[PDB]
Amino acid sequence: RIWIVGTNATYPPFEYVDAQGEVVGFDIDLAKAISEKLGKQLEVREFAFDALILNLKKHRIDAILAGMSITPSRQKEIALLPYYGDEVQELMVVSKRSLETPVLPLTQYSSVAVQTGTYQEHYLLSQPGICVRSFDSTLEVIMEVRYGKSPVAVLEPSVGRVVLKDFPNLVATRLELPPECWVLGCGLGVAKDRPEEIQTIQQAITDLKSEGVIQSLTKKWQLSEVAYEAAQ
Numbered sequence: 001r002i003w004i005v006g007t008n009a010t011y012p013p014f015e016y017v018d019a020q021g022e023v024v025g026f027d028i029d030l031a032k033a034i035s036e037k038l039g040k041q042l043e044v045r046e047f048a049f050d051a052l053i054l055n056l057k058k059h060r061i062d063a064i065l066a067g068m069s070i071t072p073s074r075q076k077e078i079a080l081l082p083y084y085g086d087e088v089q090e091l092m093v094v095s096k097r098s099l100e101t102p103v104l105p106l107t108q109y110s111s112v113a114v115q116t117g118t119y120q121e122h123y124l125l126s127q128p129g130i131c132v133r134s135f136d137s138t139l140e141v142i143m144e145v146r147y148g149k150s151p152v153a154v155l156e157p158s159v160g161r162v163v164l165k166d167f168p169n170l171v172a173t174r175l176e177l178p179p180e181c182w183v184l185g186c187g188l189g190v191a192k193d194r195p196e197e198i199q200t201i202q203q204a205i206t207d208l209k210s211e212g213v214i215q216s217l218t219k220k221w222q223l224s225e226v227a228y229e230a231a232q
């Protein structure tokens with residue numbers, strides 16, 4: 001009957017809280033489409049990002065849609081079905097335009113702002129000489145920079161490309177990741193002991209891709225490289 005998708009709505013444009021108090025975004029739109037393919041009614045529930053895997057494992061939720069990067073370590077705990085993105089080999093470092101080059105390396109700073117429980121936080125914490133401050137939300141991370149409280153932050157590029165549009169005084173610099181910290185694109189999480197749901201859900205994703213629904217949705221939430229609309 002009900003299909004519970006766990007998420008952490010802290011994370012534009014995948015899932016976040018709008019001006020009205022409503023949870024919206026690319027993942028939410030996808031969860032809606034998928035639940036329709038599944039014959040089930042969608043319910044979205046909020047958890048801390050780091051709590052999602054355990055809830056899923058325990059079947060306190062039925063799936064995860066949380067912009068969750070595919071990594072081997074996560075794959076040991078659950079299934080992650082590819083639905084967006086490609087390999088990530090770099091990160092953005094955000095700073096005020098006023099901050100003098102070189103922005104790199106990150107060891108030069110009093111702190112570096114980053115979102116909690118994320119692979120990019122774990123990268124920073126494994127590097128020598130980085131003082132990390134971690135926050136609930138992407139906005140908090142960026143506000144920490146524009147408010148002068150951290151000289152720099154780190155975002156994922158797919159996220160940074162979208163969010164930084166609204167901050168004309170911030171600038172972003174590529175920071176290549178060591179190949180041992182490259183991750184894959186985003187996967188929809190399903191418990192590993194549920195193969196039947198895996199297949200069903202995999203088939204819903206392939207169907208939405210075929211139908212052009214996933215392309216529409218990636219455009220709608222600015223997750224695709226922008227194309228021109230050409231009259232033919």
Ligand SMILES: NC(=[NH2+])NCCC[C@H](N)C(=O)O
Nearest residue numbers: 008011066067068069118119
């Ligand atoms: N809804 C969220 N808070 N998502 C955070 C995902 C960040 C990054 N893609 C990771 O998987 O570690």
